[PDB]
């Protein structure tokens, strides 16, 4: 996997969009992640019985754990590929602490572009997009590389 500079630089452009809300992405991108796949919601003790779009969108627990979330990926984003020293951690910590299966992370990404496009449509287009999916696509691969080594068939 491979993304040229340019599509580098639309990642890091709407990233910085990102960062201008974080909260309220990472809120919306958890909400749509619990909605599209319940059983994700079910990782979470601390708010793993929360139901409504209400509830979700009134939980510090939830918005606590976006704002985790993106403050992570975009950190790792942000060393467009070279991310290995930033990725072990996150690896090793969802394999053997938080036991998150590779389709989860699939989930999020999808989660991650939908809600980019939603809240972004006039920059976040088809070249964005593609560059985005480039760029998860190489978080995963790399996440379940580091699986793979610990043995974590997750
Ligand atoms: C994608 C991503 C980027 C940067 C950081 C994170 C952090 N994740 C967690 C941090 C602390 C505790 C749990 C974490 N992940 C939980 C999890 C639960 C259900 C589904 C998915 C998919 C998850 O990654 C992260 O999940
Ligand atoms: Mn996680």
Do not use: C
Not at 61 to 72: A, I, R, S, W
Not at 102 to 123: M, N, Q, T, W
């Amino acid at each position: 996997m491979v993304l040229s500079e340019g599509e580098w630089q639309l990642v890091l452009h709407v990233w910085a969009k990102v960062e201008a809300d974080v909260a309220g992405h990472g809120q919306d991108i958890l909400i749509r992640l619990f909605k599209s796949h319940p059983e994700t919601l079910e990782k979470f003790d601390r708010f793993k019985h929360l139901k409504t779009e209400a509830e979700m969108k009134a939980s510090e627990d939830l918005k606590k754990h976006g704002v985790t979330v993106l403050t992570g990926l975009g950190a790792i984003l942000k060393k467009k590929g070279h991310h290995e020293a930033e990725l072990k951690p996150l690896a090793q910590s969802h394999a053997t602490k938080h036991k998150i299966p590779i389709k989860y992370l699939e989930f999020i990404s999808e989660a991650i572009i939908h809600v980019l496009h939603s809240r972004h449509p006039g920059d976040f287009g088809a070249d964005a997009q593609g560059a985005m999916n480039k760029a998860l696509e190489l978080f995963r691969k790399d996440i379940a590389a580091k699986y793979k080594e610990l043995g974590y068939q997750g």
